[model samples]
Target: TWQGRHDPEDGQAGRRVHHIACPIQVGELANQEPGVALIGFECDAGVERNKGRTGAKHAPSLIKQALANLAWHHPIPIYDLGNIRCEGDELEQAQQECAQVIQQALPHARAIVLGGGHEIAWATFQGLAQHFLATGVKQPRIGIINFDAHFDLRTFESELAPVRPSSGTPFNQIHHFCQQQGWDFHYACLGVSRASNTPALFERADKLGVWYVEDKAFSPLSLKDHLTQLQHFIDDCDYLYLTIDLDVFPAASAPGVSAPAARGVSLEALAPYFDRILHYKNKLMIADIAEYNPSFDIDQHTARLAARLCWDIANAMAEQVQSI
Candidate 1:
């Protein structure tokens, strides 16, 4: 690779990071210190193919470019350990690789996995699962909070050697993987619009004993009570991970996702739940923002929303840390 470009601006090396910069290659995060490691996972394995355009693999770079340019320095520090790109390459294997990187980096740090697809959740949890397994706990309970219109509990036989990885099937995969291994876990699918999931999927989820919060029930007018319910539930869980799929938002507000939502979860509705997670530090694990397809966006509207959401969550996290 070229070390530096003749026109430094034009060359790849002179830049702080590449269009795709793995954190290992970049310098330490701006906020990283003795105890904290703020890592960003850039895995893009969610939608391998959807509708006409299957080029959503570029979501991470779209957002990272936005992040790299931010000039805010908060009292609470963070690390910008870049991210992993899991598109156009071997996705599953690459995901494991990224997970291992997170594992090694997660001593006192909080991780923000910038997602490729819903598939990134599998890898994200796998890393967390390994951490639990290593701790030698008799019962390590892991909880999931998915903000989406779809339950993504699509039924599929795993005997076919994993063909055309479906975003709809990740929860099932997670459930199946844990069941097969006898891992103790509970998953709560939140902000789900019933219309987004198949009837069969809901039936299967019922049979499997998963918890869900309906998207329709948490309207702005109804959110104060909804957040109370969500906080109570999340507070009960030992370790929880929150996954928000952009499609969970309304198509009017978030038009760039592959599975655009007819209606979405409100920012007002989410603030309290986020506050609870921040208040309860050890209870909240990592959070990921997944399924934002830039190719499907207009004027980068979806990307903007995704960015704002990520930043808000980060700010909330920092605020909570400060309070604690």
Candidate 2:
């Protein structure tokens, strides 16, 4: 749970995101109100084994701080549900708990999950999947759009022993889970880096029929075609899940990430497409921002970017509600 936070400046009116201990200090399965719920996953266990820098565990609070003073023009109720702590090699337990939190939040809120690593993608997806399953939603089609530098489809097992899951294996885990449950895996990835991924990962993505756009092709010149393709992808599903890996942006724009990109796509080129995503015809069931490493950041650029994305999502959802 969230322990402490600093108050915003006096002039930052209507910008405070309410911190709620729903169902805990507040109600069992409480805060059953429609709004944006910010849930934090405070664990770097996945990144620990993935051979990257640690300290992403502190990202949830850092991101909230960065967003605190930003203008909140939308009227949606924003709830800070606090962090899911993964202490001492408890990744599996943490993931399960996150899924439960998401399931509870799903009944009334659009979740914006803050991550300790990219593993949050799988956990967030799991929560949404379980929620829909329990509600008996027939043939639910969940489309996932991941903005990332790598395909993150490493094989689950290694030759010597069963490999432990890490930040590099979440999508593969989700793919296998969908297969087991007979769910349609409508996953599309944007901003893949040729240098960051292995041939095996590419082969696995191909075998899984994953739609992807390479990083070099993500630019203003290519925006129209990419947005069109994404629209078609969104049109095929009942719900959408958008995951943004900070490394998908240029290292200059987002240096505080587990893996810094050498030739990442620019945020200006990506934001328009992202706006299209948040405003897609299908509902956005859940979204998450991953791989933020405050220890590596400069001038708080990465956290600001994450907060800006949150702003975009909140306003887009608010606009959708207004249209209804």
Candidate 3:
């Protein structure tokens, strides 16, 4: 947690993010109140394999550093589960570790995973699937809503023969994993750019029946229709796992991502849509924002957006609880 800025003049009740952000171990989560659990993943293997720029592994700390000084509202416990550190090329083992942490998190609080890359998606989904399995939900309809420019539908063996799982292949891995487990796959990809995703990826998404919206459709003009459609998707799901790949945003808004979209959706146009999605509240189990590389950021613009998303998620959950 960051501790730089302080205002004793406002007294104890008035606190910033650093003041209330608490750390908790995996075993202790069962007793913790329903709030935000920050699960950090420190690994660059995914991005490296995807042939994109590395440095997303710095996401956890950078996000927290930006989050700490922001005014803490909503009066809920924010539990930090620390980072799932990945050393060398051992991404598989690290992903398993991440799954264990998220498995422990969901019973108590919403797991807000801070990513090393989009590979965090695989581990996050695995954790939730494992959670549902252990808790005896015979068939959990996990609705995955991803905000990204790319479909990330590259199969395990794509252009390269027998290639490792990269950031680009996490969704495909999940698809196969779901198939292996005899689980249903429900996915919706928002802000998909034709320029960013090749025809092959689109064909794969279509084959898998992925519900998607091109970048142009996420505007104020299409808000009502999109929200209504998204609500229908939500209604069918037993649980939801939301993931945001920063590459979904235009390069001007999110320049720090490995593959920044030249013509992606503007954040201003996308916020209302995001607000509507969060209204589902408790149905949302695990959420994450990926591909934030601090090395390429200017004036911390990317970090702030990532922090704001985390802030909004926590506050949204808290506000709903207070309303209840």
Candidate 4:
């Protein structure tokens, strides 16, 4: 699976990601050197339960393949920690398994959880929270920055946990997780579509004190205005978790999502924000790209889009460590 470009004539300077990445079992991560741990969540049960498309289970590998030949510009170690699969409809079980693995990686590497769906965010949050909790930081301020077209603030109909949560409920689930832990949930969701979300969702987003920016107002020309807000979010937190739901980009660029946006943000507009977030010192604990369903993709466009984001994140973290 690591096969890629032929660079026999060149030295290590010509290496691509496949040539540079160290594929290993999670336990082999005993090296103290900081790296980016690539963890894939191989499940679409949450999307299935959410009554959406089902091909998201295939995203991890497809995205991996999309990254195989990309130029390796990373300046630090890169660990391919493999994947966690959801058995049957056991979404919660898989989420917990992912949490355990992320907890392990957090000690040395920035855990990047590749999506099973947006539901992966719940597990990502769980892992980060548990890491700080176990490591003696009881009240860590975790800032969540989501790039997407919807708030995803819906809750389960029953408070009894009778029914399993779906992809649309991850943020709501995180809110409750923070409530129980007595930690402030610092969240900023950009590129929200007014047509894609109902007023009820807007009401709930406000109720939870979420910081949001509309899609139409976010553009290459207006990026500077929003950076001030984004800077404030980053400044107020102890650690950051960056999650990109590919559906946030327009169908032309990201057609493989379970729910494609009627209108979405452009990567040109998001470029500066990505640069700002990834390069902003040491507070970034983890990041993930979500909701890529290849069954709906046109010419592997969305996988490549996600892979490019991964490339930036890996290089940014690697460069961040070099500056230390």
Write the residue-wise lDDT of candidate 2 on 161-259 in tens digits. 678788888898888888888888898989999889888788888989999999999777888898899889988998999998998999999999988
- Assess every candidate by TM-score: 0.80, 0.90, 0.95, 0.96
Instruction: Compose the digit string of candidate 3's lDDT tens values, residues 1-324.
Output: 456477778887678878878887978878866667888888779889889999999888999888887887767767889999888888889999999998877777777888878988988998998888888888888999999998988877657676888898889888898898888889999999988888899999999989999997776778889888888988888788889999999999899889878899998888877887788886877888899998888899999989998788777666655555
Which candidate achieves the best lDDT against the true structure? Answer: 4
Tens-digit lDDT string for candidate 1 (76-145): 5545555676646476676687777566555445667676577677777777777666667546667788
Clashing pairs in model 3, backbone N/Cα/C closer than 3 A: none
Error in Å for residue 39 of model 2? 0.1
* Backbone clash count, each prediction separately: 9, 1, 0, 0
Error (Å) of candidate 2 at residue 9 is: 13
Model 2 misplacement above 4 A? 1-33, 159-162, 321-324
Q: Which runs of model 3 end up more than 4 angstroms from their true locations? A: 158-160, 320-324
- Which model scores highest in TM-score? 4
Query: Which portions of model 1 miss their true places by more than 4 Å?
Result: 1-46, 49-53, 69-73, 87-89, 156-165, 319-324
- What is the Å distance of residue 127 in model 4 from its true position? 0.6
TM-score, ranked from best to worst: 4, 3, 2, 1
What TM-score would candidate 3 get against the native?
Answer: 0.95
Candidate models: Cα lDDT each: 0.65, 0.80, 0.85, 0.87
Task: Say which prediction, candidate 3 or candidate 4, comes out ahead on lDDT.
Answer: 4
| Model 2 weakest lDDT span, ten residues long | 18-27
Candidate 4 Cα misplacement greater than 4 A, ranges: 157-163
